[model samples]
Target: SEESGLPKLPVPPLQQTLATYLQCMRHLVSEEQFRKSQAIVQQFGAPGGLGETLQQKLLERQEKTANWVSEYWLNDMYLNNRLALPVNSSPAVIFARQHFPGTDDQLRFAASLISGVLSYKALLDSHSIPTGQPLCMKQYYGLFSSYRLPGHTQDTLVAQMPEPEHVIVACCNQFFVLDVVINFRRLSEGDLFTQLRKIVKMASNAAARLPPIGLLTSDGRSEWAEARTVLVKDSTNRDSLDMIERCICLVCLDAPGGVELSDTHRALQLLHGGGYSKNGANRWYDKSLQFVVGRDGTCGVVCEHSPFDGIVLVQCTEHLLKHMTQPELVRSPMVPLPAPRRLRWKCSPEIQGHLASSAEKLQRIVKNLDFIVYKFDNYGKTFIKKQKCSPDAFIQVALQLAFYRLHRRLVPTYESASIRRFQEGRVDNIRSATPEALAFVRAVTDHKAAVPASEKLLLLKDAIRAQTAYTVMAITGMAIDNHLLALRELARAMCAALPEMFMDETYLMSNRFVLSTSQVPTTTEMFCCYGPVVPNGYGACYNPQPETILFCISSFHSCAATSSSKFAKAVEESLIDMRDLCSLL
Candidate 1:
């Protein structure tokens, strides 16, 4: 039964994994350093080596488990994070801004969006969501049903209930539970708008009495877990938490304002930050999904990264956006339905203190993040295709060049390559800063060397080919990172001493991932992604449209050497420089 739907993720050959690992190291280390690493790899792969033992153990585990890395990947990559999910882990996506002339238009749009999402939910409930080609229905299974619960030392758990009938709505830092099934069955568009209007009115009128207890969800996992324990001991808090957990998803009624579609940074701030003005505190960042609708009808989503990957959210959001634009009427007969239940909070002084402290902590984190949204209008996928280069690979090389130009040295880079071609496949790190990439960067940037344009272009093409080859391997389940991670897990599970290869300094340096990146290209005019996983690193999410490349660069101001704006400038310069070099052809 476990193998009936999506097949378990396959284990790559030991030689292929080691070869890819060595390839990744070649770019970041000196030739002498590479020789030392090569020795380590050869030893690890020798007959009766630690690599063979770990690989065998992993295979045995695969025989017992559905997917060797899924559980471990979830906990290690996301659930183990001690920081709050909102800005630290959760990513925000902004749709093309739509204008709402008045309150009626905003309410109608919100209802339409919700209806679209519920329709998608219905498809998910029946396992009828489209599959094949581009969609991976396995991820869709967790889209609406899952919630992330905080834990102490243990990793957080994803709780997926039966298909929910209701959705929670937030306004002015207050929450109201709305029954989507009931409202859609009985209420017309006008009736639904009226109900939402009343809820908004009530929420706004009662805004100042209590601190937003939901803000506590934005605190560190351990702190939130402890507060949750205290809160759940009280029956009122228990019921409130239950109500929230049981909802299908959260819909935030954001205050009206529109940022340009090209203004990636501010749009992301609205989608995930506290509120519309960057000062609003009306977000509950704990839910697996939150659909945010601005007063002007501009819409987006802030999504938790635990239950599924960003692609799942992207698919859902694209569906919802399309349905909203089309104005489809798939509904039942109109009848009288109950109003949304306003969730009452019994905010004790202790809860209030938690909220205050959490708000302070979250504010500090938000303030420290430096974001830059730059749209490179010079060229995009269309131009890359004309140049006969992979769009993703082109952007990746551009990033490697950009970082090299800025830092004057290579750093460990991580690029998420989809492995959805395999059953139950999620993602694998396609370490992009390759030796060929560094060679291209050096050829193009070496002013004193007087390199020929044709030679530089050849080097650039070679780098792109290398990236594309690695990406293909990753999608086909031959990537090394997940296999290595699984092997480590196997050793731990078997209660064996850690392998020498695992303890090597090179292994640690290679996996640190100073530049974590992912490409979330879509047809819709939206760019969405999260911040950097490390303080001195950068999180770069790029969308390659037909004619323009949009990038949202996120870094920490706390890191003296890292600047999102500088990175943005470097990326722009790199793209132009590469294009000019190609023109020499």
Candidate 2:
């Protein structure tokens, strides 16, 4: 195995981080607000100031821990939030539409998925998965063996036990456990198929039907934690909890969703599973990996995100699909095969009430989310490379133009920058709506001002270069978000008076991510989609292929200010216009 030779993530200089923070905020906030923020930043980072004190502590923390930002970032990113997982925190991914003509075909594919995961697991254990880049590779360990346990106020990622030899299967809102590694040899797809064959028969029984305990997992973390506390009083509930928590993953055999999703509408199926009446009730959202196999040929994954990020999800899922598309079979069946068993949950009337409450909340969540998948087939990285621009920076600028076109102003925009160059690194935020980007969008949108094409192109190039420069800084561990997060978190750890920099109105305003975006380019056929981090924000995930770019755009219909369809249209126009400008040059 290649050694983990990457250096530890360092705490950036106190003055530099605060100065970068001020620059990012200057264009996003008003002049008056910027001045107030400037004063706050100044006070915080003054010689032997509050920020200097925190920076010393963070430097000490870096030496003690493998990574400085891991704990603080994870809490802010996922665990600390009270929102229900699906559209707010949890992210779902859509695979290519699969064809399963018969029930047997569904089982076959599900078995193939299990076979694939086990194969990938082995490769991971052996450190044989080639990443092309020297990634942290630490995320791979959590993929197969971790689940987030709901807590009263927050939740904890439990990786205490990684020796799971079985996976929990959800069918008709019922849970079944099938041991794939009985006798120390992994079950083949055919073997897994036979086991699922028996599971289907058992799940179809009406006499043994149980309440949808899985529905409670879709509730808020505190609510679920409270419900779980009430649940485990009985041994039946306790054992079921252990079974689902420690299992490799859930093989969700979802029922046929009434309407078939088109090529562009997989967002509906993967996120909420067609609503509470459908496969939505049949999910255990706590698990890191939930593989959904719709009886009617729909398939995808609903991810619990505490353990890994989207980039890591892509790699593992790509391998899962590869193993499915090209499968390995066991030559002969082992006699005396282990039988699949249904997990029993003893639900009281009070527990049933929680289910009813969760069902209504989940329905509300489903109706509130608006989504669209737009694939720009004109060109992708090739055209950008031809223009001598980094494709990522070009896309970010185009996205900024789209937001400006629709809203007529710039807001805080977030694009994830991978920090895997460091040991145990995850990601740091890149403020995509830079000052140069604001200038570029204004020039193109202000046609009455009659800015000449030459000057507009100059502004565009400036925006692109500034964006690329920020990207380099982030990937090289100079981003301001993580550094500031460390200061805030480490300051809170001291239990002293709160800093004015954090309490200022400008801090909250500049962090309202109206456009949460990422470039999740993949080699495989599948594309990724996530809900907006904020109620009025848009989650824009783009996958750039050689000649085409696929976009999964999401927003909340409940937010009167945002619509996924409207945003999708603007994004299309922006890309075309940006390309036209490039063509003129």
Candidate 3:
């Protein structure tokens, strides 16, 4: 309730941080404006304004808190006495550094979240693989030998390595996985991305071995148990559970695969009935970092030793549970599971209609998406400029919009693995009741109740709009002119190779074929296509020089590069032209 100080709705701690951030901004913005912002948030319908109102109020409160934080919370104390932000950076650096500090352990933890055991995969792909073994670094190096560095790593890597771009690029995709989550506030994805790279710097520095910590259980015994003599190898013949065990070992290195992980007397004592969000939260975050062994005979370290926000722990756990329950993960690989008979649970007529309507809408969205441009950058530059498609080729436009809608649903995190019943053609196991199968079924059933809503349409809309605008500006035909130049050159070369017999008549048309200039029939009339025309037409003739509007395709030879002043002038001219066209339109 508004009257109550405590929020009735359960709130994630990260949301609290956001609240604090908003509060810090309040001082700069007037209280009336601040309140207005709060009111606007309530319009989103956050259940009695629980999440919404608190976010607004907390943001207001945080403005003050951030300012005075230095007075109370010592940066070193919360984050192990490490410098939170890089030293001697500007005030704006505080946006990232103040909230998140630079520590070797922290850096390592972040890297683990980003790269995962897949860093090993990355290593193997770079061609540094060992002889017949996955440990060969040469093998890994071969895979990522041509990887390019992300922009964020450019400056830092340039100071140390000549090919910094490649180095960063090699690891950039993984870097995004973690960076994207923490820097979610940035409006543009690229800005959020490079910002994450900055955070990665701290994470890299803070990397460390997981500190040895005892799991305190209620019982006096240790939290592990060794199995007795192993059973003779089954006649069916099986290599021990190698790959899965390795993955688990890489994640949790404390216990080897096939080894039972149990509550040590001491650990159980501590866990004996601790509240869900209390002791379990910290343990869950730290679990992957613990030492363990793999069935593949591989055993080593996992994530870096570092303290994570309790909120991060909670969110990760929730996401993990949801991942566990995903349909794709639970589906049987061999034979399809028999569909259960429809449950007789009744729903209101309205509710039933709503569900049907939602399903139909989803089907339409999927089908109409066929021609959507998943590769807008490619199409905008190559096809659009080449005039391969008519201006009415609404495919690109539809795709652009559709992509924006789809981009919003992307979440950055790990997905849990699922086990399904294996099938072999003409080789049915009549018994069909393996112990493993039963366990997998039980796990899937248990996970069904925990998954969060799979679809969030409003969030999707926001993401699509933001992504579309940014990408359109960044990669559109007019935007990536240099790339277009390259594409034109490549096309010219490829077309040259085509036999005259195989080429279409239209393909042979010169750039001048599409270039035609004509005087306006009226003085106010102007040339116009799908975009803004040059002038408002009022039926007066306006003739000019009869230069042909030749669509000349040429490479942007760096040899003819213009001076800075010339480039600036050209840009200014383009902007003016765009503005004029916009006005006329």
Candidate 4:
């Protein structure tokens, strides 16, 4: 009885998940079908059922690992997905555009950025990385060194020792490793300044520049992995891959766009850098963190989504922008530091074909992305809190109303609930499409029904309460999604026959998230966005500030069922109407 720590729980739940699963699926599926699914759930959670066996397996699994679900969750969410990083798997954050008042100001910004990164690493090494839950802290340590290597079928994430001493810089579609620490002294901002300038001058040589080699990495994972197989066959290309892979991060010195862009387009640049013809080819999207600085003063961070969390990106990026304003080394060093070396690639005729083909595919990706950043400035979290309602739940209900207005039915919605309070915890889904939420949307959208404003407000509160309640359960590790996922995956791992609950049609429907959303609140002048998990769905990342809410909505133009601009318009309308109900009876 001498066990000590932030005490943990056994993997003991069996009935609650099946109970919650039936509740969540009822509104989304037909009543008859729901009852059919309900029967299957009863069998699963019944005594001496398959669920009991899996629970035993999970309890068997828990004792031998750090977190029982971590490995399975990682592979399912990220490693198993064969999509390209940009616009598919990677998420990017956009900061306010800089004007670059002086020539080479972009390079100077790069210097401050790299210096800030080194500062970030210094803090991590000193064990001062803003800790709370000890196991959650382990996630951030991978930010600097994590690399997602593409296998033909699935990718592998490698985060190991050699914690990122140098960073790779991409300019003119070439990678060069600039050592931030040369012979034990961290490079001053001034030192990084000179190195970036040198990089730009050297990359200016047109004949010496290779093809846009980075474009291949942005292709489909299998395509990229196969391309990689051919690439490493050449020793020169293998060396090039190793340098970029071993980098602490990437600093992309992007080509200037002569004209200024709207706020929406500026954010898109952070997502995929406007494709291969533009700054898109400038990224090695395989790296976990890439710092982008452009000659025209556009800048932001693009993250490979495997190992880095969006929270970590915001925390570290806020530090960089904060560090940039602090007075530091303005003057060049007394003696010039070592020069940055280029990562050379010998493109065979085959790789040259891959380059041309991949760029064409990248152009298609850029064109097909239906993305828009909508800033709802009329009111935000303040107005909801004033109404004595949860801001996140209020927004979630607003989203449901918007979708219902657009398409007369509800689809399964997913909002991320962080479980970081638990050891090595990641996100669990807060299935936003609940029966109460369905009722609220029905009353709000029914034109013929004589629903009073007071009734609508009451219904809204009920939905919000239900949403908030589900969020609490999810964050406390009582949600249905992760538990079911663990059980299913464990059975597969143990080579047990597939269970009927998973075989049910309801299981298939729940996995297709039509609306994937998260609230990424930040105080800095930045917003984050990612593509939809399914082509026909929408990805909504909301940053609810005090006075305004920023919504980055993404859908594919190829999907006739969804349109980002239309959905964004509906969100504004929904927010406006929902606020009207708050004006009181």
- Scored by TM-score, the top model is 2
List TM-score per model, in order: 0.93, 0.97, 0.16, 0.96
The lDDT ranking, best first, is 2, 4, 1, 3
Per-candidate clashes come to 0, 0, 76, 0
Worst 10 residues of 4 by lDDT: 2-11
Model 2, span 62-166: residue lDDT tens: 988889999999888888888888878778888888888899999988988888888998898787988645668788899978989898887898884333389
Return model 3's CA RMSD, one decimal: 32.4
Stretches of candidate 3 exceeding 4 Å from the true structure: 1-56, 67-288, 293-296, 300-306, 309-585
lDDT of each: 0.79, 0.87, 0.22, 0.85
> Which segments of candidate 2 are over 4 A away from where they belong?
1-4, 131-133, 161-164
Q: What is the lDDT of residue 229 in candidate 3?
A: 8
lDDT of 1 by residue, 191-263 (tens): 5676789878888774444456777787788888988887887787788788888788888787644454446
Best by lDDT: 2
- For residue 368, model 1's alpha carbon misses the true position, in angstroms, by 1.0
In model 1, pairs of residues that clash are: none
* Cα RMSD for candidates in order: 2.6, 1.6, 32.4, 2.1
lDDT per residue as tens, model 4, 1-585: 733344342363788788888889988888899889988998888999889999988887787765788888888888889877888879888878888876478888888888889888889878788774444666788888789998888889988644337899999888888888745567777778888888888898787787788889899998999899999998988888888888899999888764466677877788888987788889988899998887777888899988857777788889988987888855436375566898887878898889888888888888989999999999988889998889999999999999999988889998888777766777788999889989998999997997988999999889999999999888788898888888999778766667888889999899889899988888888888999988889989999988889999999999998999999999999999888988876
lDDT of 3 by residue, 1-585 (tens): 523232111112433423432332343245676575455433422455333443444344444442211211112112222111100000000001111233333333333322333333333445333322111111112221221111211100010111111111111101111211111121122332333345334323334211111111111111110000010122211222111111222122111113222211111112211211112111111122222122212222212112221122222323333332333212112122222111011224443343344234323322211110011121222332232222111121222222122222111111011000111000000111112222222222234554222222222223334333323332211121122122223333446653321132211221111111111111111111110001110010111212211110111112232122232233233223222322331
